[PDB]
Symmetry: C3
Subunit: 340 residues, 3 copies
């Protein structure tokens, strides 16, 4: 909501409350998304200030508050800042921001990250360029300097983040993306590469000094229809766990595909169908193994721009024999959302 607009500065305070539950058999330990209460809230602000006719400054901060914790010792489980960045945008020259922000490969992966609750499986947080990540400098360009309608490109530098776990760490790297959109159609490519830290190199799973991620997308978003596909591959980038040996690391190689189809009826119903598969290769001790493999059926009803509910069912196709011990059971999410 726009809670302040004066002197060329406008501020957006936003947020939501999501009542959310997952249903899966038994513990949910052997399932796609687990089991139980998953309620949470969000709070964020995004600001935009007019410095002059050609120059705008902006910033944004976004936080996640889990609402499925006690008020006791686990009160903080899963809380975090999601975004925190400030930047400048000039004319048709381009924009630059720094902070915690989306890695550039998400420019492609965004095409399919459209499911009510699940999906966007390969867009991992703190995983180089595929998702939200800290210390990223990003240059963006709209309509090629104002010369080409619908053509955008982006260049991003990722600072080194040496953390106490290999999962959330990374070395220095560079990536970029390019996209063209014309009258309903969208196409996008993105690539990123970066050094791995010594801690990542010390993990049992994943072998190499460099990490690489890329992905391409096609979409059609005209009127009430939404169709999109993504394809991508990664080297030493995708985080994995062997539940049998309690071993952790990254996948030497992955190949992923994501498809989504949805339709928005004017009366508020938005049915959804999707497919996602992420395969890993050359995993030490395992070889080839599916990481994600499922169909999705679901729907969201929008009462309005502020209220909605949704069901999201995961027809999980990972088999009970999966060599990594990836969960084989289905998961369904039901939720009710208030946002401003």
């Amino acid at each position: 909501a726009e809670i302040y607009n004066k002197d060329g500065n406008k501020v957006d305070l936003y947020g939501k409350a999501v009542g959310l539950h997952y249903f899966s058999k038994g513990n949910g330990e052997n399932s796609y998304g687990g089991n139980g209460d998953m309620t949470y809230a969000r709070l964020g602000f995004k600001g935009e200030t007019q410095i002059n006719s050609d120059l705008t400054g902006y910033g944004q901060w976004e936080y996640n508050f889990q609402g499925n914790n006690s008020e006791g010792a686990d009160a903080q489980t899963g809380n975090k800042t999601r975004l925190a960045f400030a930047g400048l945008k000039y004319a048709d020259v381009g924009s630059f921001d720094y902070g915690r922000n989306y890695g550039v490969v998400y420019d492609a992966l965004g095409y399919t990250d459209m499911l009510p609750e699940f999906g966007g499986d390969t867009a991992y947080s703190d995983d180089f360029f595929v998702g939200r990540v800290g210390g990223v400098a990003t240059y963006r360009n709209s309509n090629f300097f104002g010369l080409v309608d619908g053509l955008n490109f982006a260049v991003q530098y990722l600072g080194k983040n040496e953390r106490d776990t290999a999962r959330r760490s990374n070395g220095d790297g560079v990536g970029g993306s390019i996209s063209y959109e014309y009258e309903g159609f969208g196409i996008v490519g993105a690539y990123g590469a970066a050094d791995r830290t010594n801690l990542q190199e010390a993990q049992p799973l994943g072998n190499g000094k460099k990490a690489e991620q890329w992905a391409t997308g096609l979409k059609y978003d005209a009127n009430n229809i939404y169709l999109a596909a993504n394809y991508g591959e990664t080297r030493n980038a995708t985080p994995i766990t062997n539940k049998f040996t309690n071993t952790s690391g990254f996948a030497n190689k992955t190949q992923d595909v994501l498809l989504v189809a949805q339709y928005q009826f004017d009366f508020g119903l938005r049915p959804s169908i999707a497919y996602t598969k992420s395969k890993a290769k050359d995993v030490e001790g395992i070889g080839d193994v599916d990481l994600v493999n499922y169909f999705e059926v679901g729907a969201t009803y929008y009462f309005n721009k502020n209220m909605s509910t949704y069901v999201d069912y995961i027809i999980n196709q990972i088999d009970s024999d999966n060599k990594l011990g990836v969960g084989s059971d289905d998961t369904v999410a039901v939720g009710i959302v208030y946002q401003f």
Copy 2:
């Protein structure tokens, strides 16, 4: 404060800062409420959107920020989300919300939870139906489908929350409440029952597979007067500790009474008197033992709807011999509050 109201959606951003101190003898270790700085702040939003003439959607999120922690290693002690839920309300049919919300037995216990700082002793957080708790689905009905002025009822399902401590866990359960209010008078009953988790069943204190809580209330709230009483009992629900053996569990049985009387002078003074007693029975190794036993005198002055101060004194009647090692000393709280 209503910081946004447009297009049928209104948003309330609220919060307060409370400068608060407790005074009790010595360490305060042997006292009712402890000793020292107890300053804190709150932040929350509650939203309400008009979907149509008969349908409203709504959500709310509420957080506690302790202000008596250092900026160091204890920076987070006692911080938590208090409420996080969204729901729909239709005509006279009723309302439904899901998320972290008040257990239905609080519909009764609310009558006496009216003291400036203390009181509401049996309304434990994450304790089934008596207080705030996660994963609760709640149906509410006002004026019996629009047919009976002042008659309300509520039905609530509590999802299982299997946490890492028995204190904050619970199994599946169902509860409800009914209340009738007419011209100053209020009466209310509520009951709740639920399964206990294996972790709760493994604790030294408390024996049984089921937990049960109920309570009834009477109140008079006309003009400047406020009088209210609560009575209630619980089985395997009330959390307790034996300080001698450092043993923890739940009370097999409790019987509780809460009384409050207050008067609001037009010039802003609101004097308060209260009595609270919570007895436990069949406690392993102990038998019968008082958990809470005190009189309360205190007062709040309201400078206005935004500013107030208060003193709250606890005449603690727990004896120095208390078999559980419950604190025997008095406690007084003094506070100054800014809220919006």
Copy 3:
């Protein structure tokens, strides 16, 4: 931003997003400010309500959200409430607030805490009267009861805070400050003294039962110029670490000086030069040793009241032989800030 103003109550919701990076050689382990992403955000509210013609009530809460953490296990590192207090102000009689607030010796140290990113080295958090601290009661007086233009004084009681570390603890104490400002000139003195806790007395570094801090300031702030100096000394108050022995405590004695000079050009550039030196004496096993010793050059450009960027370079003069193992390398910070 003033997001609500009605019925004599005005509320300020403010905050910022700061994209921030530090550059220092190698690990940055041997440097002044370290190395890497240092992005963060702030959120706070400050409220002011008219109780009557002579009486205003007020409160404020301020929180720090680090934006250089993963969304994983370190998600919370460095997050905290900075301020949380409420108070009343009456006529020319004075104001009183309680909560987490600035220690009174900061009334002096504020003169030089003016650098873009660094500086204000001796204003430690949770360090008695020099910085933000919990459970402080503060009386302030403006213009000597309305009798003396520019003369202010303050008296502050510090409640005991017995925490789990000696660093963030303190005993009871009292301090005050006095300041006089006339047409660009400012002068200020402040003193504070307090008991030390048993935990502080048990630390290897620092010997004594009492802690003491004082400081004086002179400044000139007319037009576009800013000049200020501070001098101060402390006993058993300044927190220190011996990196060689991994020993911790407080400095028996410190003597500190802080100088700053800045100029604000009308077109938005604000160049900055500074000097800071903090020496410790009678440190067990060491004797005399510099804690801080550097020159600062830097600048901030203000695009407007909402947008800015800055570079801050620390010419670190601590030598590589420093007996405490204080970092000897330089550090430069670059940042881009959006605030409302």
